[PDB]
Amino acid sequence: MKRDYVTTETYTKEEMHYLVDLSLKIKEAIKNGYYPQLLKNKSLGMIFQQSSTRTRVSFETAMEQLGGHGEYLAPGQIQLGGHETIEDTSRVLSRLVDILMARVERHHSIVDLANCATIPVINGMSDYNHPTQELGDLCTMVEHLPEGKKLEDCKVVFVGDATQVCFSLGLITTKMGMNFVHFGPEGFQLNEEHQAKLAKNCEVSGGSFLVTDDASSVEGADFLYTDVWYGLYEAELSEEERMKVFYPKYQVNQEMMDRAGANCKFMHCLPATRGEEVTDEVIDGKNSICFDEAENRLTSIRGLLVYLMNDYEAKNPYDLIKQAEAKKELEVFLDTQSI
Amino acid sequence: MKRDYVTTETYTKEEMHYLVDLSLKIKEAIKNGYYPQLLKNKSLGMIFQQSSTRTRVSFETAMEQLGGHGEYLAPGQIQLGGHETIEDTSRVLSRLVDILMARVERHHSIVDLANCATIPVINGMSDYNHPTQELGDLCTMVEHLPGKKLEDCKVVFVGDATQVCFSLGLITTKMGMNFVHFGPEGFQLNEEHQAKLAKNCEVSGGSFLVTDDASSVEGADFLYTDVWYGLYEAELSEEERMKVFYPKYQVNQEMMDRAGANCKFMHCLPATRGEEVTDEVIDGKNSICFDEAENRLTSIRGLLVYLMNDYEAKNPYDLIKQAEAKKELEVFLDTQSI
Amino acid sequence: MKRDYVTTETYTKEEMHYLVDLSLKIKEAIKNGYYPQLLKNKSLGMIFQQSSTRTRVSFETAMEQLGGHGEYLAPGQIQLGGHETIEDTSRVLSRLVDILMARVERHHSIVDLANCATIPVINGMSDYNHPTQELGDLCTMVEHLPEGKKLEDCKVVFVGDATQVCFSLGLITTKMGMNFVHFGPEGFQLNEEHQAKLAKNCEVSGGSFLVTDDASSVEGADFLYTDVWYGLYEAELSEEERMKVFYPKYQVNQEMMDRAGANCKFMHCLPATRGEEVTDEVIDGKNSICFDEAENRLTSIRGLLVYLMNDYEAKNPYDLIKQAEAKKELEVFLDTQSI
Ligand SMILES: N[C@@H](CCCNC(=O)CP(=O)(O)O)C(=O)O
Ligand SMILES: N[C@@H](CCCNC(=O)CP(=O)(O)O)C(=O)O
Ligand SMILES: N[C@@H](CCCNC(=O)CP(=O)(O)O)C(=O)O
Ligand code: NI
């Protein structure tokens, strides 16, 4: 048996709080130079169907820091998607690595990969959600809480396009009982199916959500978050197309930051298009935390990797008697046996 | 001095038996959570001219588990083939890594890579053979013996005369088993292939047959197949391979039943479901191709360890020089500043 | 605070001697089977915008041998250059790896990477220079000194095109007080800006330099070095064009080696186009050291990685009290808490 991390929908608020604490404890060790070897000799498979800096580097660095190794599987290097099915790739890699992640074009690909694998599977971003981004962002919001405010009393406003990141931020904030607002133009807002999911989260947590094109909605924001305008990796919008849709109403500039509040923090998942969704002045300003946010991609990924491997080991414990016997048997073989 | 693993033609049956035993001992250790650090701080170079999942991941996971590291060198990343010859690449990498593997478009590349390198070299598949697949398949058959001995078993390969087909021929006839290639005219193992299988058998007491007779599958303990689309660089179309192989060479439940109730299904993977094999067979109770994929890792761990142990035995470290060098570096780092 | 390795122009002769010595001491340890774990659990980011065998393999192997890991970031794998600016990539990776190297198309990219990063940055080759090649060639010339001669006693002649390797070799030889010659045809010689820098090196070092199309300039050389004729990776000179420029006058054949002197050594950064800049007979001959030179790409890279990380740790030391406290708190958490 095993557990996956495909969506935060299968995790309670309490479970996410455990993941934040675990991640932050590991972070404090490493920043002071103790590298806990919690994943010693473990191997991670890393399937990427799209380009990536933060997610990919975070997984490779995490494995090394914890005593294991991440294997990068680019497009064209593996047979998946043409000569081999998703179910076969899954069953095979279950025999070859200890834990698996994938960034996929279509959400169904990660669902199938997780369902057919006998080892833990992590979603590195699909067209539907970005759950490792969720934990990273939450870690970041915990570290940058406004003075005298609790997490659930905070207002988080996503500005612009209804990307997978926009939805994910909605899912995590509402899960933790916070107040979420998506400020976006008509035709590019979170849809009815998205909103019913936020509604289900809010009944349990006591949080709230709004989806609107009202410019005043930013007022009182403690966190202001944005993403790129050019859409999905495989079907980008042209510069001219996205400008007509979002510019200038949805550009996070200094006057918008001032409209939200003097203490409001700027967040972005990155990469950013400077001059489009955000100005140089904001992203490089004193209230930008999007570089601490990028650091926290690594923070959250270490905690998840450690939690899921701990979970797997508890469900599939090693036999220590058989372990010592096998060790002894290999050592005798190497001592006495020649080719 | 060194040893290579380019073809099992340079290995005796007894040597192949040792490699099996070593690989299985490592597997039982790791299965129970003991990772033997037998390749500590060693670097493997990995040249891939074609796509791979099982071979590539197996070498990377293998090195991590044993205390070392594998480096993936994909096409376009290195200058080999355009601005650099294979002999220079070989001489350069012999100075930069401890051990080398390559999956090549053409067999002469691995031959030349091995002969010019001063470090051990492994063939990760050519157009000619696939020797790490041979050891992995041998490990698999040992674990799934019918009660028969290995040398009493019949192994039928079904379909195209791929490099995997011939490699299975070589390993089975080397171990003294009974081999059949069941394939259509024009796509059978050729006269040069068969002469090598014949040389193996005269030594081992095994047997071989190349035929298009469907009754040849009867009594098979293992029934093995591969894809129909040929070489990576020049694939056969969907319409053309169907005309060549379908339905005669599709491994379906009728064929498995004709082989025998206890016949096991093997396939090197990736498989084209609905072509060389049906969903029913590959997902069925008698399919062992996923155990077989696991054993690509098993066999590769054993090979890396053997070849490095052999290398170390032939080029041993001077422990007096080792301690003197260690002391000198420590004195340097303690006392000297930029 | 940190230090970079972008150009040997920021390093004194005494500093370069230290680096050679460190690299040679590490080399002798590893050659005899002792792997010093000087970079335990550290991560190196490797940005490659061009193809590479020696530089890429040296970095990955170097990290494994010293206890760390190198991460390969190829073209198309990261969004830098299209959807992300050089400055943002630098600040982000500063949070995700410990040390960074890049092979860049344009020299301004490595300068910007280094200037914006809070971690050490190594130049893995640009269109301007190639400083890890410089240190490798220095280690190589030290190991192959003529009897009774010092490095500063030696005459080094570079043959052919004014490549970045040509200029770099000029920089490192003049820095160390040696006698450097560029033997190249008019229009393809080191320009006035290059020569002015060599002249300034010579004022301090006691060395000398000459740029000439005179064939007799090879006479009395202790090392004879060459490179390809096809120019830059992005803008290659065709076979017919380059042959018309250089062939046969600038081909390193046995006649040129004999003209240089019986004991003269042949050097080449590689890869070599046999039949163009050099013949089979010379590169495969008894006086060829280019494969030893290739080995010393790894020799020099190990020394550089260690020095820069030691420098960083000295400037940014870990606090051992906070380290132990962080270790204990993590250990307590894993013992007592569950999801
Ligand atoms: N809406 C964006 C989301 C990017 C999220 N960014 C990350 O995960 C950081 P990375 O891509 O460098 O890993 C898109 O669809 O591209
Ligand atoms: N005849 C096939 C052989 C593939 C063997 N499969 C493997 O080695 C598994 P891999 O490709 O995932 O490493 C071909 O030439 O393509
Ligand atoms: N003038 C040459 C310099 C190549 C240097 N070679 C190396 O650094 C060895 P590598 O490319 O294998 O890393 C060019 O611009 O191509
Ligand atoms: Ni690696």
Author numbering:
A (entry chain C), C (entry chain A): 1 to 339
B (entry chain B): 1 to 146, 148 to 339
What does the paper say about this structure?
Transcarbamylases are the enzymes that carry out this work, by carbamylating an amine using as donor the carbamyl group of CP. Similarly, agmatine, the decarboxylated analogue of arginine, can be used as a fermentative source of ATP utilizing putrescine transcarbamylase (PTC) in this process. Each subunit has a characteristic shape consisting of a hemispheric subunit body and a projecting tail formed by a C-terminal helix (helix 13) that is a characteristic and exclusive PTC feature.
Indeed, the determination of the crystal structure of PTC bound to the bisubstrate inhibitor for ornithine utilization, PALO (see below), provided a direct proof that PTC is able to handle ornithine as substrate. Molecular replacement with the refined model for one PTC-PAPU protomer yielded two trimers in the asymmetric unit of the PTC-PALO crystal. In contrast, in the PTC-PALO complex the phenolic group of Y233 is far from the ornithine and it interacts extensively with the carbon chain of Q50, leaving widely exposed the ornithine moiety of PALO. A change in the position of Y233 in the PTC-PALO complex may also account for the decreased kcat of PTC for ornithine. In this complex the hydrogen bond between the Y233 phenolic O atom and Q79* is lost and the position of Q79* and of the 80-loop* is changed.
